[PDB]
Amino acid sequence: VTGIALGMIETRGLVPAIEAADAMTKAAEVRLVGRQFVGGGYVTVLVRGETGAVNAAVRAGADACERVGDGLVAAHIIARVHSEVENILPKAPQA
Amino acid sequence: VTGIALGMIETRGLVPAIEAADAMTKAAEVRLVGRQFVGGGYVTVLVRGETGAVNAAVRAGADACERVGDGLVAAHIIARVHSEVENILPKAPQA
Amino acid sequence: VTGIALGMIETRGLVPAIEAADAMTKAAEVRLVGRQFVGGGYVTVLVRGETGAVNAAVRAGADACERVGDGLVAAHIIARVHSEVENILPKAPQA
Amino acid sequence: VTGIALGMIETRGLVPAIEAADAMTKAAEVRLVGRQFVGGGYVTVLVRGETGAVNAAVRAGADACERVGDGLVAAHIIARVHSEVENILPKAPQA
Amino acid sequence: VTGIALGMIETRGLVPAIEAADAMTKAAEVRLVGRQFVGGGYVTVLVRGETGAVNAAVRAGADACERVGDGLVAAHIIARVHSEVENILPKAPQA
Amino acid sequence: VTGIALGMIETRGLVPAIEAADAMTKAAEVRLVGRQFVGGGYVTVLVRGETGAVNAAVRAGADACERVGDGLVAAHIIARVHSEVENILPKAPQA
C-alpha cells in the first residue's frame, strides 16, 4: 500500500510482460503502476511496494516470464529511488 | 460473456494477429478486448472468457496463426489475473 | 460494395504496401478500409468485399508487391470474420 | 500542378529521404505531398504529377538518395492509382 | 540547482535507463530533466547540473547501468551546450 | 540568421545526435530547426544557415558524433532545397 521500493521487469513483447505483472502481483503486496511500450519490442512493467514485497515480487515475475514468448530482458529492484527519479516513474498505467 | 480468464497471442506482424483473433473467437465464447501494437513488429491480441473457453480459444488461435506471415511469438492463458493486472488490460480495442 | 470478406497483405515498408493496395483495388471490386503502420517496418493494407472479389484482389496484390522494395510478408483472406473481429478492423483509413 | 501519377521512394532513415525529395522536386514538375515515418527506420516520400514528370522525378530521386546514409529501399511509380487508393495517400505533409 | 552542464546516458531498454537515472541523481546534485523513448529500443536519460556534478553523475550512472538488462549504449557530458541546443533539450520529463 | 542552406546529420540514438547538434551550432552560425525521431533508432538533427556556415557546421557535427554511442549514419548538405521541400522541413523543434 505505502512502500516506495521499485520493482522492474523488461521483456521482449507484451505477453511475457503480462505474465511478469501477474506473477509479481500474486507473489507479494505490490502495486502495478506502469506498463511501458519502450520501442523496438521492449515492454517494461513497474511495481511499487515495501522492500521485502518488491524483492519477492521481482523474483517471482522473473521466474514466470522467462518461459513465455520471447522472454526476459531484465529484472531489477531499486529499494529507494532518489526523489528526482519519481519524475520519470508512472503513477498509474494506461490501458 | 462474464468469464474473467485471459487469453493472449503475440505475433510478428498484424496479419497473423488478425488470423489468431478470428480463430480464437470462432473456437469458443470469448470476447476480443484488445489488439496492441507493441513496437518492433510485435502485435498482441487479448481475449476474455471463462477458463474452458479461453483454453480452447488460445489453442485454436495458436494453431491458426503460426502458418500466417511471420508467425507466432507466444500463446498464453492466465485463468484468473490478479486484480492489479486489470489496470493494464484493455477494456475494448481501438480500430 | 456490401461484401464482408477480408483481404490482407502485410509488407516490409510502405511502398510495396501501396503497390499491393493499387493492385488489389484494380483486380476486383473491393473497398480499401485500412493501411496500418504496425511498428518494426511492417505495414498492412486491408480490403473488404465479396468472397470472390477479395480472393482475386489478394492474389493480385500479392503478385504485384513481392517485386517492390523489401517485399511481401503475408497475404491472407478471411471470407467471414467472427462478429468479434469487427472490433479491431478499421472502418476507413487515415491519410 | 494537376497530374495524378504517384512517385514513391522509401529509404532507410530520414536523411536519404530528404535528398530523394529534393532531387525529385528539382528533376520535374511534381508536388511533394507526403513524407511518412513508417516504423523500423523506413521513411517514404511521395510526389504527385503528370506521368512523364513523375517518371523523371523518381529516376532522379533514386540516383541521388542511394549514395546518402543507409540508402534506398524502393523507387516506384503508379501512373494512375485506383480511386480507392486516394484514401490512403497524404494530401500534404506534416512538418 | 542552477548549473547548465548536460549529462546523458543512452541504454538498450528502459530498465537500465532507470538504474542510470537513479545512480546519476544519487551520485551528485543533478536534476533529472528528461527520459526519452528514441525508437528501436533506445532510451536516453538527461541530467542538468554544474560541471563537476554532471561529471560525477554520468560516471556513476554509466558504471551502474552497464550491468542491467541489455545495457549501455552511450555516456556523455556537454559542460556548456550552445544556446541553440536548449531548443531540443527537455525542460522536465513526462511520466 | 537568414540563410536557407540545410545541414543534416542522422545518428543511431539520441545521444550522438545531441553531440552533433552542439558541435554544428558551435562550429558556425546555424539555427537548429529540428530533431526528429525517425523510428528504428534513427535520430536526425537539422540546421539552417548560409552555405559556408552549414558546410562548416555539418563537417564539425560529423567529426564529433561518430565517436559517441552507436554513432553516425549520414551527414549531408543541401545548399538550396527546392521550394517544395520546405513543406517537409521542421520550422522549430519540439522539446
Author numbering:
A (entry chain A), B (entry chain A), C (entry chain A), D (entry chain A), E (entry chain A), F (entry chain A): 4 to 98
From the paper:
The prototypical bacterial microcompartment is the carboxysome, which is found in many bacteria that fix CO2 into organic carbon. The carboxysome shell is formed mainly by the assembly of many copies of a few small shell proteins. Here the crystal structure is reported for CsoS1A. This protein and the nearly identical CsoS1C protein are the main constituents of the alpha carboxysome shell in the chemoautotroph H. neapolitanus. CsoS1A forms a cyclic hexameric building block from six monomeric subunits, as observed previously in the CcmK2 and CcmK4 shell subunits from Syn.
One of these sites was in the hexagonal pore, whereas the others were at the locations where the 2-fold and 3-fold axes of symmetry pass through the layer, i.e., where two hexamers meet at an edge and where three meet at a corner. Sulfur atoms scatter X-rays anomalously, so an anomalous difference Fourier map was used to visualize possible sulfate ions. Recall that sulfate (carrying a −2 charge) could be seen bound in the pore, whereas the natural intermediate bicarbonate was not seen to be tightly bound.
